């Protein structure tokens, strides 16, 4: 591969890592628009616009977990806002459901989720973290929200 | 290009080689550091896959007599075996010489650091020598200690760096306190205390060396040297902080490749009252690499009174020297005569043995018997533990003018204050 | 009678003039016939004698003052130490000795120096963003004083004053990331009353009964946990954490989120009060199971008894069936008149739940808005709340945002 490192199981990119290789130009620079990095079954991060993936170690930078995501583990190794992956992005986290305090089961029923207005809860959880809620899909518990940077 | 100099006033003089552990089945590949030395009390600590072994240092040192085969390995020498349930990859000793740390990997349980009170080794009334405290790194594979260093002046303080990139500063008294940690995304590859022990320097995957207070509050960044391109990106493999503005820094290919060979780089830093850039001098491969199978690792140490650096490497059968010049600023390789070098032997199966641990004794009191008739005063002894389980001692004779004897007489270890499990 | 002249005491002028120059605030505590008022600007206590003049008071100085703001003060069970509780630290002050016919501190000197000791100082400086969420004393009146600290890392640590930098016990309950489980973190805890428990509960043996205190832990999302603490027999790292306690009966809104305060009333079976930022108060019976469950006997909406503010809960020293709630709108008193109907044998089986349900349909708690702090412009929370226990009638002291001393009744 021409610079990019991604080996953690379950992770992928759109375009695929193989496609990113061929996109690399004569001077070895990988610039792509609308790039996505995801982990099958847990979520993904969509970066609208052009980004320079040249010599980025995505294994060390991007971390997608259940109901959680991290980009750049420490602030010291983080580039300024607008450069690298520290920029505007749309995050999707899957398997996001509340737990019934009586049965201790996950609440996946759309009607039940509308009863407790889980969507409004996720709007609040987004603002409190500096993000803007976008939508929620009960069938898969997909919580989509935009972030100004990481 | 690389500065070099025939040195006829320094020789390494081999003592008999002494077998410590039995030869392994395979070549040990992983980064490891398995020799420690108490220069206060005259003990050596050796570790492997197969237990921990403690010796009075003078028992390991045996001089060649005329007539003797200097290549014949002594089979064993009396010391103490402390059984260990798992293999050891790192051993180190605190600056008061009372805490030995032993790092182990268990396939079942992952990594643990055992801490031994060194008096327990001397406690005749304990048939079993147990550590008094453990520290469990929740981690399994990424929990391998890849660098671990006690503070040169704060006896309770130790810095530990793991394979996953995380780092921690520990306080070990009667128990283990985590004082500071930095998570894996910081990407630490190596670690080293300032001379007085007031800051910690950490090497990093991105090629930089960051300085820190022991609280891990960041103080100064040394950038990745300008001569490395973007399409040949590197990582600090090892670091030695020599003086406030002086470091030895080893770079290796960022990606982990073993084929490329590491560069030892001397770095001089500017001051607040200077706006000079950093001066780097690439001495490159002073320990010539015959092996591309092992994880890279330079064993570096500074001997102030001699103003020089000893260097060994996991990929090399040879120990090298970088000395400061009369100049007092710049460095040069010392090129020594054929029969005065420090090299690990060829194994009886005709392969090269390589270093797993390196230490220097300063408690040696015996005089070097040169001829039948000539005798020189005691010298420090370089000791290498090899991949074959053989210990390789060499007197370091520095006949350069003005060098003062470094020998320091050892003391008796009193069991007073021994910590208990 | 001090109920008459206390609001005119100069200490409130002093504190009021200190204004002109998050945790819920409580800058006052009472001891004997004395009232203690924390003066943030001078880092000292102003002590007014209520029993036995408007200008007279003692100043108890910190020999080593805290540099972080003190939000809450909390007298120890043995009453020899005061916890100075802030967001960025905790400091313990040792009270001086008394002597003289009036039992004044050190014979009635105008100023008395008090020894202080910081607690868990490492955790608040090493991790800059680490904050204190809740703190209390270990309830024992016999053992050395121990403070219990819940920090923003979702960990509870217990410290002896003999070793204020090294926890005796740690309870891992399990910000760089974007997370949906933002409420899976503890915001408060409260100890229940003394209980005798089998020594086997802590892994030791003998079929012998030991002293322990139930520790109830409240998550922001409303979930509750329970563990029993014995300073002697509990392990250094406590892992026998029970919960989340199932909450019965099933509620359409799942009892919401945004829980902010918890109180264990001193009764058997234990009864928990859970308060939310929206003004919801849940009265939960702890039913024995090995995991117990909660039966929400009733719910009270303070928004109806008069709302997005932090709510603080206070026990009543006289009656286990009464507690008080402080918020930006003032003080509410809540009387659970049905507490005395629940017997000690109650369990968590179906017939017990049905009996509790049937009983809740014919029983209701008494809620009263006793003090109103609502402004004319932006509402402000109170700074102090204390119930002076007198058997002839409890007197309540409430210090407003402007250090006005309201007394009720």
Q: Is A102 within 8 Å of C176 when comparing Cβ atoms?
A: no
Nearest to A3 by CA among A44, A64, A65, A52: A52
Chain C hits for A74, CB-CB cut-off 8 Å, are 176
Q: Any idea what the Cα angle at residue C61 is, between residues C55 and C62, rounded to 5°?
A: 155
Report the phi/psi class of residue C402: left, alpha or beta, with left for phi > 0 and alpha for psi in -120 to 50. Answer: alpha
DSSP C159-205: EETTSTTS-SEEEE----SEES-TT-SEEEEEE---EEEEGGGGT--
Residues belonging to chain C with any Cβ–Cβ distance to chain B shorter than 8 Å: 122, 125-126, 166
Longest dimension (CA), chain A: 61
Nearest to B181 by CA among C126, A115, C193: C126
In the stretch 36-95 of chain A, residues with CB closer than 8 A to chain C read 63, 65, 67-70, 73-74, 91, 93
Distance CA C15, CA C384 (A): 12
Q: What is the dihedral of CA B67, B70, B72, B73, to 10 degrees?
A: 130
Backbone φ and ψ for C108, nearest 5 degrees, come out as 90, 20
User: What tokens does C326 get?
Assistant: 């402080």
Q: Is C126 within 8 Å of B177 when comparing Cβ atoms?
A: no
Is B138 in the C-facing interface, judged by CB distances under 8 Å? no
Q: Where are the beta strands (DSSP E) in chain A?
A: 11-14, 31-39, 43-52, 62-65, 68-71, 89-93, 131-137, 142-147
Is B74 in the C-facing interface, judged by CB distances under 8 Å? no
Distance CA B230, CA C340 (A): 77
In the stretch 62-121 of chain A, residues with CB closer than 8 A to chain B read 70, 72-74, 76-77
Taking a C-beta distance cutoff of 8 angstroms, is the pair C161, C81 a contact?
yes
Sign (positive/negative) of CA torsion B153, B156, B159, B163? positive
Q: What is the dihedral of CA B66, B69, B73, B75, to 10 degrees?
A: -70
Backbone φ and ψ for B260, nearest 5 degrees, come out as -65, 150
**Interface B-C: count of C-beta contacts within 8 A:** 6
Least CA distance to C176: which residue of chain A?
A: A70
How do the residues of chain A divide into helix, strand and coil, expressed in percent and rounded to 5?
Answer: 20, 35, 45
In the numeric block, the tokens 């580039």 are attached to A79
Backbone φ and ψ for B118, nearest 5 degrees, come out as -65, -30
Distance CA C257, CA A121 (A): 8
Distance CA B208, CA B193 (A): 16
For residue A5, CA distances in Å to A51, A59, B195, B323, C177 come to 16, 6, 37, 39, 22
For chain C, what is the radius of gyration of the CA atoms? 22
Least CA distance to A97: which residue of chain C?
A: C180
Taking a C-beta distance cutoff of 8 angstroms, is the pair B360, B37 a contact?
yes
Distance from CA of B180 to the nearest CA of C (A): 7
Distance CA C260, CA C107 (A): 43
Taking a C-beta distance cutoff of 8 angstroms, is the pair B216, B180 a contact?
yes
Q: Is B179 within 8 Å of C126 when comparing Cβ atoms?
A: yes
Distance CA B304, CA B293 (A): 33
Taking a C-beta distance cutoff of 8 angstroms, is the pair B53, B368 a contact?
no
Distance from CA of B221 to the nearest CA of A (A): 11
For residue B42, CA distances in Å to A15, B408, B410, C134 come to 62, 10, 6, 52
Burial C162-172 (b: 16+ CB within 10 A, else e): eebeebbbebe
Is C278 in the A-facing interface, judged by CB distances under 8 Å? no
User: What tokens does B63 get?
Assistant: 């001089």
H/E stretch holding C83: strand C81-85
Is residue B69 packed enough to be buried (19+ CB in 10 Å), middle (13-18) or exposed (0-12)?
Answer: exposed
Mutate to test the interface with A, among C127, C179, C180 (most CBs of A within 10 A): C180
For residue A102, CA distances in Å to A6, C243, C360 come to 42, 12, 18
User: What tokens does B149 get?
Assistant: 């260093």
Distance CA C333, CA C327 (A): 12
Least CA distance to B229: which residue of chain A?
A: A55
Longest dimension (CA), chain C: 65
Mutate to test the interface with C, among A61, A65, A102 (most CBs of C within 10 A): A102
Is B133 in the C-facing interface, judged by CB distances under 8 Å? no
Distance from CA of B217 to the nearest CA of C (A): 9
* Segments in A42-90 forming alpha helices (H): 58-61
Distance CA B53, CA B48 (A): 9
H/E stretch holding B57: helix B57-60
Distance CA C114, CA B223 (A): 51
Q: Is C246 within 8 Å of A147 when comparing Cβ atoms?
A: no
Is A12 in the B-facing interface, judged by CB distances under 8 Å? no
Q: Is A74 within 8 Å of B218 when comparing Cβ atoms?
A: no
Chain B hits for C125, CB-CB cut-off 8 Å, are 215
Distance CA B161, CA B173 (A): 20
Q: Is B187 within 8 Å of A77 when comparing Cβ atoms?
A: yes
Taking a C-beta distance cutoff of 8 angstroms, is the pair B191, B241 a contact?
no
In the numeric block, the tokens 């204190």 are attached to C132
Least CA distance to B216: which residue of chain C?
A: C126
Chain C hits for B177, CB-CB cut-off 8 Å, are 166
In the numeric block, the tokens 């997005």 are attached to C308
Taking a C-beta distance cutoff of 8 angstroms, is the pair C74, C66 a contact?
no
Q: Is B117 helix (H, G, I), strand (E, B) or coil?
A: strand
Q: What are residue C398's DSSP bridge partners?
A: C385, C406
Least CA distance to C247: which residue of chain A?
A: A102
First-residue to last-residue Cα distance in chain C = 13
Nearest to A116 by CA among C281, C277, C257, C183: C257
First-residue to last-residue Cα distance in chain A = 26
Count of CB atoms situated within 10 Å of the CB of B301? 16
User: What tokens does B156 get?
Assistant: 């309770």
Mutate to test the interface with A, among C176, C178, C299 (most CBs of A within 10 A): C178
Report the phi/psi class of residue B42: left, alpha or beta, with left for phi > 0 and alpha for psi in -120 to 50. Answer: left
Q: Is B215 within 8 Å of C126 when comparing Cβ atoms?
A: yes
Q: Where are the beta strands (DSSP E) in B314-377?
A: 320-324, 331-335, 355-361, 368-369, 375-376
Is B186 in the C-facing interface, judged by CB distances under 8 Å? no
Residues 6+ apart with CB under 8 A from A75: none
Say whether the peptide bond before residue C277 is cis (omega within 30 degrees of 0): no
Q: Identify how the structure was determined.
A: cryo-EM
Q: Is B300 helix (H, G, I), strand (E, B) or coil?
A: strand
β-strands C178-179, A68-71 pairing = antiparallel
Nearest to C61 by CA among C107, C95, C26, C25: C95
Q: What is the dihedral of CA C269, C273, C274, C279, to 10 degrees?
A: 150
Task: Tell how far CA B102 is from the center of its chain.
Answer: 14
Taking a C-beta distance cutoff of 8 angstroms, is the pair B363, B97 a contact?
no
Residues 6+ apart with CB under 8 A from B349: none
Distance from CA of C223 to the nearest CA of A (A): 7
Q: Is C254 within 8 Å of A67 when comparing Cβ atoms?
A: no
Distance CA B93, CA C63 (A): 41
Is B62 in the C-facing interface, judged by CB distances under 8 Å? no
Say whether the peptide bond before residue C269 is cis (omega within 30 degrees of 0): yes
User: What tokens does C186 get?
Assistant: 């503890």
Distance CA C65, CA B373 (A): 74
Q: Is B179 within 8 Å of C166 when comparing Cβ atoms?
A: no
Distance from CA of B112 to the nearest CA of A (A): 24
Taking a C-beta distance cutoff of 8 angstroms, is the pair C284, C226 a contact?
no
For residue B356, CA distances in Å to B90, B249, B295, B296, C402 come to 9, 20, 11, 11, 71
């Amino acid at each position: 591969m021409a610079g990019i490192i991604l080996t953690k199981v379950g992770y992928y990119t759109i375009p695929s890592m193989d496609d990113l290789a061929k996109i690399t130009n004569e001077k070895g620079e990988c610039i792509v628009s609308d790039f996505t990095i995801g982990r099958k079954g847990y979520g993904s991060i969509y970066f609208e616009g052009d980004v320079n993936l040249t010599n980025l170690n995505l294994d060390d930078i991007v971390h997608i977990r259940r109901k959680e995501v991290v980009v750049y583990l420490d602030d010291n190794q983080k580039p300024p806002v607008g450069e690298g992956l520290n920029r505007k992005a749309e995050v999707t986290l899957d398997g996001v459901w509340p737990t019934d305090k009586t049965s201790r089961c996950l609440i996946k029923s759309p009607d039940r989720l509308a009863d407790i207005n889980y969507e409004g809860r996720l709007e609040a959880v987004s603002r409190k973290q500096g993000a803007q809620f976008k939508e929620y899909r009960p069938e898969t518990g997909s919580w989509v929200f935009k972030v100004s940077h990481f | 290009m690389i500065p070099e100099r025939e040195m006829k006033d320094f020789q390494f003089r081999a003592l008999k080689k002494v077998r410590i552990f039995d030869s392994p089945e395979e070549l040990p590949k992983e980064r490891s550091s398995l020799l420690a030395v108490s220069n206060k009390y005259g003990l050596v600590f050796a570790g492997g896959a197969s237990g921990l072994q403690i010796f009075p240092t003078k028992n390991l040192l045996i001089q060649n007599k005329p007539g003797d085969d200097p290549n014949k390995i002594v089979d064993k020498v009396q010391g103490l075996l402390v059984p260990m349930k798992f293999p050891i990859h790192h051993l180190a000793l605190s600056c008061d010489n009372l805490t030995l740390s032993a790092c182990m990997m268990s396939s079942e349980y992952g990594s643990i650091i055992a801490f031994f009170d060194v008096r327990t080794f001397s406690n005749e009334a304990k048939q079993q020598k147990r550590p008094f405290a453990y520290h469990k790194l929740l981690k399994d594979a990424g929990g391998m200690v890849i660098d671990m260093k006690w503070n040169p002046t704060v006896p309770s303080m130790v810095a530990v760096c793991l394979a996953d990139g995380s780092i921690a500063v520990l306080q070990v008294t009667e128990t283990v306190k985590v004082c500071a940690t930095l998570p894996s995304t910081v990407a630490v590859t190596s670690v080293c205390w300032s001379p007085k022990g007031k800051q910690l320097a950490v090497g990093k995957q991105n090629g930089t060396v960051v300085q820190y207070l022991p609280t891990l509050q960041e103080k100064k960044v040394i950038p990745c040297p300008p001569f490395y391109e973007s399409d040949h990106p590197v990582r600090v493999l090892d670091v030695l902080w020599i003086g406030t503005y002086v470091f030895a820094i080893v770079y290796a290919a960022a990606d982990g490749t073993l084929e490329t060979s590491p560069d030892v780089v001397m770095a001089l830093l500017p001051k607040k009252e200077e706006k000079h850039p950093e001066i780097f001098v690439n001495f490159m491969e002073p320990c010539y690499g015959s092996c591309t199978e092992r994880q890279h690792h330079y064993y570096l140490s500074y001997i102030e009174e001699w103003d020089l650096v000893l260097a060994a490497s996991a990929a090399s059968t040879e120990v090298s020297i970088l000395a400061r010049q009369s100049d007092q600023i710049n460095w040069e390789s010392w090129l020594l005569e054929d029969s005065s070098r420090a090299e690990l032997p060829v194994t009886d199966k005709s392969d090269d043995s390589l270093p797993m641990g390196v230490v220097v004794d300063y408690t040696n009191q015996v005089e070097i018997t040169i001829s039948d008739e000539k005798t020189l005063p005691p010298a420090p002894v370089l000791m290498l533990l090899s991949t074959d389980g053989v210990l390789c001692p060499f007197y370091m004779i520095n006949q350069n003018p003005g060098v003062k004897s470094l020998i320091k007489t050892p003391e008796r270890l009193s069991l007073e204050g021994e910590r208990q499990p | 009678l001090w109920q008459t002249w206390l609001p005119n005491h100069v200490v409130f002028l002093r504190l009021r003039e200190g204004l002109k120059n998050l945790l819920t605030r409580n800058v006052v505590f009472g001891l004997g016939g004395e009232l203690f008022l924390w003066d943030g600007e001078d880092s000292s206590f102003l002590v007014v004698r209520l029993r036995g003049a408007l200008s007279q008071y003692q100043r108890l100085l910190c020999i080593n003052p805290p540099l972080f703001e003190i939000y809450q003060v909390l007298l120890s069970p043995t009453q020899h130490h005061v916890a100075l509780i802030g967001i960025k630290g905790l400091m313990v002050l040792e009270l001086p000795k008394r002597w003289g016919k009036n039992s004044e501190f050190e014979g009635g000197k105008s100023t008395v120096n008090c020894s202080t000791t910081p607690v868990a100082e490492r955790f608040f400086t090493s991790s800059t963003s680490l904050t204190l969420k809740h703190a209390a004393w270990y309830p024992s009146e016999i053992l050395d004083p121990h403070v219990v600290l819940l920090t923003s890392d979702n960990v509870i640590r217990i410290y002896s004053l003999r070793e204020p930098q090294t926890p005796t016990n740690v309870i891992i309950l399990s910000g760089r990331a974007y997370t949906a489980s933002l409420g899976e973190t503890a915001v408060a805890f409260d100890f229940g009353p003394l209980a005798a428990v089998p020594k086997t509960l802590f892994g030791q043996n003998g079929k012998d009964e030991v002293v322990a205190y139930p520790l109830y832990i409240l998550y922001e999302n409303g979930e509750t946990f329970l563990t029993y603490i014995s300073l002697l027999h509990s392990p250094g790292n406590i892992g026998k954490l029970l919960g989340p306690l199932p909450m019965h009966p099933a509620a359409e809104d799942n009892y919401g989120y945004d829980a902010c305060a918890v109180l264990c009333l001193p009764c058997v079976p234990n009864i928990l009060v859970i308060a939310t930022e929206s003004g919801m108060l849940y009265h939960c019976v702890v039913l024995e199971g090995l995991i117990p469950s909660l039966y929400v006997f009733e719910c009270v909406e303070l928004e109806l008894a008069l709302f997005s503010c932090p709510v603080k809960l206070h026990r009543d020293p006289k009656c286990p069936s009464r507690y008080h709630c402080t918020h930006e709108a003032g003080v509410h008193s809540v009387g659970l008149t049905w507490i005395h109907k629940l017997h000690k044998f109650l369990g968590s089986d179906e017939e017990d739940k049905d009996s509790l349900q049937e009983l809740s349909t014919e029983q209701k708690c008494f809620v009263e808005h006793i003090l109103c702090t609502k402004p004319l412009r932006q509402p402000a929370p109170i700074r102090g709340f204390w119930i002076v226990p007198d058997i002839l009638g409890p007197t309540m002291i409430c210090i407003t945002s402007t250090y006005e001393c309201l007394i009720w009744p």
